[PDB]
Amino acid sequence: NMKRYMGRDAQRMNILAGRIIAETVRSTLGPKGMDKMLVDDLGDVVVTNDGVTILREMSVEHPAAKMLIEVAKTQEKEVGDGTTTAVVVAGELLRKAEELLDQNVHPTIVVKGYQAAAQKAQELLKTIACEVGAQDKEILTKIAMTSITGKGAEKAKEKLAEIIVEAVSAVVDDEGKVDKDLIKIEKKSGASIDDTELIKGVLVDKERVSAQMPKKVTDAKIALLNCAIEIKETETDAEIRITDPAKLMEFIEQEEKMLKDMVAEIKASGANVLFCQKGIDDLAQHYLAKEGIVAARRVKKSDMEKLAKATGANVITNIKDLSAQDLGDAGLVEERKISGDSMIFVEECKHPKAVTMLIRGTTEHVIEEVARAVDDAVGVVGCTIEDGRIVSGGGSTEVELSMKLREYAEGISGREQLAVRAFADALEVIPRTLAENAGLDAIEILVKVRAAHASNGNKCAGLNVFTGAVEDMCENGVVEPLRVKTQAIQSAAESTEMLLRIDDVIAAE
Amino acid sequence: NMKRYMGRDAQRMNILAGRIIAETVRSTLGPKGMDKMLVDDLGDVVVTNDGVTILREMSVEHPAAKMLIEVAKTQEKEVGDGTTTAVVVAGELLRKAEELLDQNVHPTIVVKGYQAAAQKAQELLKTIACEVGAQDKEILTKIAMTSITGKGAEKAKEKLAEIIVEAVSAVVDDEGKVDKDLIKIEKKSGASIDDTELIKGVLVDKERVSAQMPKKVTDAKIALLNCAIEIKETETDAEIRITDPAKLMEFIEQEEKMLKDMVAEIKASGANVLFCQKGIDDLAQHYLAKEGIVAARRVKKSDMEKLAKATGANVITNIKDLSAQDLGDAGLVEERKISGDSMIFVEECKHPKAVTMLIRGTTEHVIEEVARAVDDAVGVVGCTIEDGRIVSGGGSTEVELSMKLREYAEGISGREQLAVRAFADALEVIPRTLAENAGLDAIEILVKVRAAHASNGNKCAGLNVFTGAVEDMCENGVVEPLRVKTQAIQSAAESTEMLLRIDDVIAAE
Amino acid sequence: NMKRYMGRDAQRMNILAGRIIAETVRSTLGPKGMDKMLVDDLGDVVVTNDGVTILREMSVEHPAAKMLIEVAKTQEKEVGDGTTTAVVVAGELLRKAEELLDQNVHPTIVVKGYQAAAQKAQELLKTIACEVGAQDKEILTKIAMTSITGKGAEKAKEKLAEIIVEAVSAVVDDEGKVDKDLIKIEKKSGASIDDTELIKGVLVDKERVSAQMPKKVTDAKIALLNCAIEIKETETDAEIRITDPAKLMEFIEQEEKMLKDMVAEIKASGANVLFCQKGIDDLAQHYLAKEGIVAARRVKKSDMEKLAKATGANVITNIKDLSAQDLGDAGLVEERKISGDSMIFVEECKHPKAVTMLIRGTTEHVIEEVARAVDDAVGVVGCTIEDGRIVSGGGSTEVELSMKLREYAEGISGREQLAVRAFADALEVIPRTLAENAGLDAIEILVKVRAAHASNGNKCAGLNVFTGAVEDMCENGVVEPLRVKTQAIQSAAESTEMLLRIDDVIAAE
């Protein structure tokens, strides 16, 4: 009871399971790579080139495969881009590993050399990484442009990269990190892809609470309330008792006087637009509309935190302590009807720490894929602002890193040496699969790039899938954050070091 | 409808199916190899080290595997020994092939280099094969001794090899081939393995037709009859009519006078032992016994052909034309009770062209495996008598053949060159798996043997699984017929060249 | 009841079914094409590059597909080679046809232009076919060599083509056709592919009827008997009656005297080897062996007709009329044990009209594919002897025929003109798919070959899959019988003209 694979069977069972889900994303890799169509049990379809979203949203049951998906799952988590490359490298480390295991090289020697090599790979990547200033907009734009390409050249429009760089640059909390959650991504239809705009504001999925209120306010002062604009019932249970018929109107007029007071306290701060997180009582909607104050009820807790950071307001839980300095400032607050639905556009803000990317396109599935292309572009721009180190793309720093590990291996005595050469040769899978998907001769090209790296220059030389020939990738404008490669290598090395240590499997049910 | 594997899937489906049944026999290879126990649906068990009998008598259903079994199945057919080596080489050619297919090397280029290399391998084996005289008994005994070992050192007893060489030497039809079917293998119990004897005669599974007949005849003259010693009924339908009561005894006495005549015609030739293929009439058994002539009825057609070639008789279909010169001559014809059953031992013949190997042992499954070790020993001795060329064993001519193919590959321009190096490296699987099964370090040993082959000497240097260190295999006495290696390589090369050409599979039901 | 497809659905149902089995063989086409592995319900596997054997032995159920298989099935029937090209052309005529049907071109107009174009294609092929002498052995050898290639360059060995040409040249019945059934193809194991020999004789699957008979006869005179060498029982029912006891021996001795007479009548002709179609009586086997006459009983009726044409004998049904001039003459008749089984080799004949091709190889599936390569080579050599006209290969006469039909289309007014241009463009599928399977750029190459055909030269210019560039195919030695192309085009044109006329389908069950 119940199923057990022994030694050479358990090792080949896993290595194969890893190689086989690594081959599932191989064809997506590069600008000349292809998309996959995934359907589930409900008939819901999603078409994408994003490696991790393919692996995450497909039913994988083999335990060794589930564990190599973790590599892509934590690559989007730490970087944003490079999910397909991390898995493909992990796959080719497994292939190159069984060639040693079939030559009787003990798994502990393989894993020893694999780790000695991934250590060297990290400290070799630090020396070959160009140093770049966190505000070099022309270089950040190339980094954003190289990320959108790879999902395809047609998605990579110039004006979209400039928009992305300007949005990531805005949400930087001095000093000095980039929060990916601060850039709100909204997906609406329209005849677009080119109509995707950067909104320096927030988009709230709510309408004006009363129709009598204005629908367009310019240079508006915005107040944010966590308090409920209703009657304040006491915590210790309370009940009123009326014995005089003339006391009826007393309590009602006193209660509705508490609502007149609250609306008059909001006008005292000078605020003409109001976003309440809790509910607003019906009488108070009438008094607000009479004052000319645009208000919205039951706004999401997450949208209140967006508005607060974007306009420059404060979330106040006590309407009595609403000061005039706790109001935010936005150049336009308007209720538009975009794509059928009506929403409140709070835009044109002065100094935003939160920003909305309105991603638009013709069909919902087109929109959803451009959205995934921006999540990747935001990830790499954020990584260059934090790290300040970039490397050349097009499989260029893999060839350079490959040849430097091979001459590092010559200086290693022992059979661990074979595992370091194996590791080096595995890295060359990125330049090779860029060529396969391009249509070009992978074997031939890999030799021209390898020979154009020997001695001194170039280091920045790699395959250009559009030109066909081997070009200088730095002068071309093909660049990635250092974190894309160091993470992809480390996570591929650590997960395959673990699978290789397995010699027995025990599967139930 | 119904199941189809495309391109990279179909190629990996087959290659894997071939590698996996090649790994099923890997552990049997060598003197330090292990046996397999095979059970079927009926509960009938057979334990063996013979590669082909393992592959033949196990339920293999994968079409690509069925086709690599053909390699073992036609190795026993053409050589007798080397069935495991042929499959293991074919397996390692498949492994080394997907390493090229995963680097995008077109299958047509792989198969081109594989064939160019197997051509060279054949004409390189001709030069390194020592020339040996078809009757060099001390060398033929070494060739028989090297074959029995490998099924295990304990089976390889000195006196058994000498017996086998003397039996194969006897059945050689001048000029000048060896028929494996002329050496009759019989399996009887007893407390043995050491009681296996060479019988210069035939063992007939019959008894004396009448108990009154002698049970031991020395220097007997043997007559062989294809004719039935009964009354000859005419082909055109005949019937007798009796009208006189005195005519009853006439026909009966006349009919039994035809049987007296037939027995008197056999005694006229001088024959005192008689083997009839058809039936012998009851009256004629009595007259034969009265003359002292030992006879046996309904002897198998195959046993008549054995007796004819062994004693030097002629199979006569007409009892009237039984000359005195058509009798065979054997030194002892006796009815013994060996292992419970009683049989006629026709032994001690002068000049036999047929011979019986009485293989004996304690249990039926022990006997059956010693029988398989003799079928192999008879195969290789027969191959040395026909070919007259031998090579050194212990993975010695694989290392030599490997290093010569590698320097032949340097003289090849093109990507076919990678397939020739692959082919060379595949051959080193025999020295390597000899070391695995021995317990020794396969990687280390393979280097000492490879380095002891460079320059001039030795060529005859290989791994000695008993010594541990690399020894000169020719001086040790470890030698195989050239045909064991040239066949194993050619059949491994032709079958894997065919699987590699497959890119689509269509499996029904 | 039950399933009916209307108009545009029925037309697309069929065209698709035809395009889809045409794509099933597309990858086999050319020397750089790949093999298929076919498995059935019983687990029996066959691996082949032969187009028709793929289509024949796979379960195809779609009626429109079954009808396009007829095209390959009658291409082997009339030519032997070109089965894949005929189907692939038929497929591309269907593809090019729906492009017209989707532009509203009536099916009757399509089929009109298709037929006007296939007429022109036939009379254009007559002018571009080189005239070749039926005994130009160097040209016949190139034709045999071009046929074996395409199933793969590795099968195409020089010495095998010379053997094939010599065998087809031998069986020519003056004047002056070639019967494919006169060249007997036999498949036996061995370590071969190179051990395939031409036997100027017949190989009979029988043994010597008596072991006492010789096993090797040189310059033997062979008698062939359709008569049974037994006692002749009368047709009108007969029965013998014996009343005298001395009459018993009378009839037996008289009956066996009829057998002594028959054997003495065969020795009278001077024949020392005998092949009987019926049975031979046991007494008569003894008398034959005593005379030294090698005989074989119950020889197949088909093998008797082989021997008769090969040795130069006559099949005699009356043993009394066996003249001395009715004996055949063969240089060697021997009973060998080839591949385990023992057979009678009747070889080295003087003037054979029947010939045996002993096709040998290492595994049964390797043998069976080389056998299919020879059936194709025999087909094309036979077509060149009969026709005396050949064309250039490598998709060369398709490009030339394509460009000549396109300028013939300009001289056609009406919408039928669109179907003639469609037909011309469909022919370019052979040069294009030769390039796809080679790996080369199909679009680019097709332009270099098309441009190297314009004006005068070359006409014999086409793609060389080994060189890569466009070469002169006549000087290279790449040539096909005219019948391969004219048959492939006619059968593709007639079957797709019929499918295109279908507008309604009625499928039951």
Ligand SMILES: Nc1ncnc2c1ncn2[C@@H]1O[C@H](COP(=O)(O)OP(=O)(O)NP(=O)(O)O)[C@@H](O)[C@H]1O
């Ligand atoms: N114009 C270009 N020329 C050559 N290589 C390029 C170009 N643009 C991008 N690349 C390279 O292509 C790879 C990116 O391919 P892509 O298919 O997007 O996969 P990924 O980024 O690894 N994963 P993911 O985008 O998360 O699905 C990187 O190695 C880039 O350096």
Ligand SMILES: Nc1ncnc2c1ncn2[C@@H]1O[C@H](COP(=O)(O)OP(=O)(O)NP(=O)(O)O)[C@@H](O)[C@H]1O
């Ligand atoms: N004393 C020895 N030392 C080293 N190698 C040996 C020795 N005896 C035999 N061999 C080698 O061991 C191999 C034979 O091993 P074995 O396990 O019998 O398989 P096989 O002969 O390939 N097939 P089979 O015997 O038909 O099951 C050959 O390559 C021999 O040359």
Ligand SMILES: Nc1ncnc2c1ncn2[C@@H]1O[C@H](COP(=O)(O)OP(=O)(O)NP(=O)(O)O)[C@@H](O)[C@H]1O
């Ligand atoms: N050396 C060569 N160079 C270029 N073309 C060649 C060469 N040899 C053969 N051909 C062409 O390749 C085609 C034959 O390919 P092949 O794959 O054998 O299919 P087929 O002959 O159409 N059918 P079949 O052989 O019956 O399976 C013909 O059009 C040949 O003229």
Ligand SMILES: [Mg+2]
């Ligand atoms: Mg990307």
Ligand SMILES: [Mg+2]
């Ligand atoms: Mg052996």
Ligand SMILES: [Mg+2]
């Ligand atoms: Mg052909």
